[PDB]
Design a protein around this ligand. Structure first.
Ligand SMILES: *[C@@H]1O[C@H](CO)[C@@H](O[C@@H]2O[C@H](CO)[C@@H](O[C@@H]3O[C@H](CO[C@H]4O[C@H](CO)[C@@H](O)[C@H](O)[C@@H]4O)[C@@H](O)[C@H](O[C@H]4O[C@H](CO)[C@@H](O)[C@H](O)[C@@H]4O)[C@@H]3O)[C@H](O)[C@H]2NC(C)=O)[C@H](O)[C@H]1NC(C)=O
Ligand SMILES: *[C@@H]1O[C@H](CO)[C@@H](O[C@@H]2O[C@H](CO)[C@@H](O)[C@H](O)[C@H]2NC(C)=O)[C@H](O)[C@H]1NC(C)=O
Ligand SMILES: *[C@@H]1O[C@H](CO)[C@@H](O[C@@H]2O[C@H](CO)[C@@H](O)[C@H](O)[C@H]2NC(C)=O)[C@H](O)[C@H]1NC(C)=O
Ligand SMILES: *[C@@H]1O[C@H](CO)[C@@H](O[C@@H]2O[C@H](CO)[C@@H](O)[C@H](O)[C@H]2NC(C)=O)[C@H](O)[C@H]1NC(C)=O
Ligand SMILES: *[C@@H]1O[C@H](CO)[C@@H](O)[C@H](O)[C@H]1NC(C)=O
Ligand SMILES: *[C@@H]1O[C@H](CO)[C@@H](O)[C@H](O)[C@H]1NC(C)=O
Lengths: 308, 51, 50, 50, 50, 51
């Protein structure tokens, strides 16, 4: 609820630290995403008004300017100190800004908006423009099968090359996410430099590598936030790997109306009960359903037995 | 079979004939001579009477 | 040495005389094998480093 | 058995294990001073074994 | 044969042709040819089974 | 070493809290000894642990 301003200027917005230019409060990590509109990129060129607390090798309060979507992204620089930086460009049509904070500080902030309208060079998907790459999946609700084949069913890369696609999971308001791997196979096991699947928590940033799977077995992770992000880095020589996850929104129990209480620190919605697909760890929801009748010799009067 | 032992043509320590008999036994074992020999002497009198 | 350059130690790893050729220890046997159940399998784990 | 069927026959807490013997078919293993507490205050359960 | 390995710890059955080229140790496991067949059931004992 | 130009030892005392250094020998004048303790009370370093 406190990050600052986002202001939607027609090209590039100037971003303020929380409570500009007073002391920004402790334990604040806003995850500012430059949208970086098509046919162009971003060029920040930081302000002269700049004070974020100095550190030995910037292991304290800093400002990551990583060129990349989130988290795992390549780093440009790590800025801490009182000397106002400058000379910021982009190497792609997205850039991510994260501003972390420790518990015992005092500092002012940073300001920069935009400078860039030439056209980029390379043609990743094939053609003239072809972004880097459009797999940003916003899906939510109570449940949904996050499948790996959505990169090919929705056609956002050519067959053969490397893939890097990101699923983002929101949940029902005030809830958590129970991620569950139904199917999970790869082709080069125990090798996280060729194919892996990672899960995030609250943001797609680097803080929340809850689990990085690149081995034969995936397990059920249990997120703490209402935002979960799953990526799949599979390179050129291993595009056969697949996984089919299944998130499930849940609230910690005092269980009430519109809850079911799978007995594993979970309240799930009652739409998830006898859904046909198991949503908890043990199928407590898919139990005491489909309990038809007794018929006996009556319905045995048929084409075979009923003639006799 | 509880244990698993095995017989063998004994040779002195570091004998040249160990490798030439091992090749010779494996040749006899696949042609079927060591099943013709065992069913010649462990054949016995040919029992049971109606089993 | 140069203050805004750090140590430019040449150190070359080349001009040593021909005295020692490396890997002088107990030879690690490269045991070849094939995977077949239940003789040789892959371990079923979640942690990646192996 | 239990290492094979993980997340199937490995419960999360004592309260879920009591509510799984009572409903499903289950043979939950726990401390002996809690079984002598549950059986005395839930008349349809029992202790088998020593 | 090309000395690209040292051991061959595997289900590598000792036969005539392989022994003539490479050298095996004494067998750590002996075996043979046996028969699979379906375990008998007894669901149809005819109709005059009385 | 205390910083030369400024008289704010917050970047020094934060590295001393993080490194778990509870036993400190200050070599200062008494005009600067009163200056560190107001900057050690503004941080959480005037506890029953520190000597
Ligand atoms: C006389 O000399 C020069 C002007 O001619 C002045 O500056 C001194 O010289 C250099 C300047 O480049 C300094 O040397 C390096 O300082 C680093 C300190 O880290 C910086 O920390 C933050 C940013 O992180 C800045 O705010 C801060 O001002 C510092 O710049 C050290 O980390 C360096 O150590 C290593 O760095 C490289 C590694 O590649 C090597 O070249 C080094 O040899 C060493 O291995 C290095 O110490 C120097 O510190 C400056 N002096 C001072 C006191 O800061 C002088 O000030 C001027 N006067 C005097 C009295 O020397
Ligand atoms: C560090 O020293 C090496 C010499 O060992 C320098 O390498 C040579 O530098 C000269 C002058 O710059 C060139 O003419 C040569 O062609 C270089 N040779 C090689 C093999 O690189 C090196 O430049 C020095 N490093 C720095 C930063 O000056
Ligand atoms: C200690 O110094 C000796 C002498 O310089 C080093 O040994 C020689 O290193 C040179 C290269 O610098 C080689 O050309 C010689 O063949 C080395 N001689 C021997 C006997 O090893 C030695 O490397 C140094 N030790 C350490 C730990 O750096
Ligand atoms: C006898 O015992 C069985 C044990 O399974 C009982 O069946 C269960 O009883 C619980 C009571 O808490 C209920 O959830 C259901 O009636 C049954 N659970 C299931 C089917 O999962 C039942 O009391 C008796 N059953 C019979 C056939 O006599
Ligand atoms: C969840 O619960 C609400 C009521 O709490 C119900 O109306 C709805 O159908 C359920 N399912 C979904 C997917 O929202
Ligand atoms: C035991 O059976 C059911 C639960 O399985 C319970 O409702 C019932 O009251 C119990 N019987 C007793 C306590 O006699």
């Amino acid at each position: 609820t406190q990050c600052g301003i986002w202001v939607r200027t027609s090209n590039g917005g100037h971003f303020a630290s929380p409570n500009y230019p007073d002391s920004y409060p402790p334990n604040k990590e806003c995850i500012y995403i430059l949208e970086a509109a098509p046919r162009q990129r971003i060029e920040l060129t930081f302000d002269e008004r700049y004070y974020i607390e100095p550190s030995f090798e910037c292991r304290f309060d800093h400002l990551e300017v990583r060129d990349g979507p989130f988290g795992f992204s390549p780093l440009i620089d790590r800025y801490c100190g009182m000397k106002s930086p400058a000379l910021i460009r982009s190497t792609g049509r997205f850039m991510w800004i994260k501003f972390s904070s420790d518990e015992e500080l005092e500092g002012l902030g940073f300001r920069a908006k935009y400078s860039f309208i030439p056209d980029p060079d390379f043609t990743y998907l094939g053609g003239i423009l072809n972004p880097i790459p459009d797999c940003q999946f916003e899906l939510s609700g109570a449940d949904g099968i996050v499948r790996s084949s959505q990169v090919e069913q929705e056609e956002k890369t050519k067959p053969g090359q490397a893939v890097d696609c990101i699923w983002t999971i929101k949940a029902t308001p005030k809830a958590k996410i129970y991620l569950r791997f139904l199917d999970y196979q790869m082709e080069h096991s125990n090798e996280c430099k060729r194919n892996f699947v990672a899960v995030y928590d609250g943001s797609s940033a680097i803080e929340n590598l809850k689990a990085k799977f690149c081995s034969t077995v995936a397990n059920d992770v249990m997120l703490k936030t209402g935002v979960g992000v799953i990526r799949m880095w599979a390179d050129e020589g291993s595009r056969l790997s697949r996984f089919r996850m299944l998130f499930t929104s849940f609230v910690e129990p005092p269980c009430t109306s519109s809850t079911f209480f799978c007995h594993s620190n979970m309240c799930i919605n009652n739409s998830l009960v006898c859904n046909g697909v198991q949503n908890c760890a043990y199928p407590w929801d898919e139990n005491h359903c489909k309990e038809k009748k007794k018929a006996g010799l009556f319905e045995q009067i048929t084409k075979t037995h009923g003639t006799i | 079979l509880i244990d698993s032992k095995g017989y063998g043509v004994g040779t002195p320590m570091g004998s040249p004939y160990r490798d030439k008999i091992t090749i010779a036994i494996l040749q006899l074992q696949e042609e079927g001579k060591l099943h013709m020999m065992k069913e010649k002497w462990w054949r016995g009198n040919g029992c049971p009477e109606e089993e | 040495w140069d203050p805004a350059s750090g140590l430019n130690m040449t150190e070359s790893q080349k001009g040593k005389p021909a005295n020692i050729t490396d890997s002088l220890s107990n030879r690690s046997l490269i045991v070849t094998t094939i995977l077949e159940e239940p003789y040789v399998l892959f371990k079923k784990s979640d942690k990646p480093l192996y | 058995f239990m290492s094979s069927r993980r997340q199937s026959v490995l419960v999360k807490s004592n309260e879920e294990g009591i509510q799984r013997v009572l409903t499903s078919d289950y043979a939950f293993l726990m401390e002996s001073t809690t079984i002598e507490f549950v059986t005395q205050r839930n008349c349809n359960l029992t202790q088998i074994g020593g | 044969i090309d000395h690209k390995a040292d051991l061959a710890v595997a289900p590598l059955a000792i036969t005539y042709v392989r022994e003539k080229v490479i050298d095996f140790s004494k067998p750590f496991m002996t075996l043979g040819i046996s028969i699979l067949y379906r375990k008998p059931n007894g669901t149809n004992p005819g109709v005059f089974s009385f | 070493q205390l910083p030369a130009d400024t008289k704010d030892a917050k970047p020094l005392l934060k590295e001393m809290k993080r490194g778990k250094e509870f036993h400190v020998i200050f070599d200062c004048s008494h005009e600067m000894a009163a200056g560190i303790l107001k900057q050690a009370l503004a941080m959480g370093m005037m506890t029953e642990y520190y000597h």
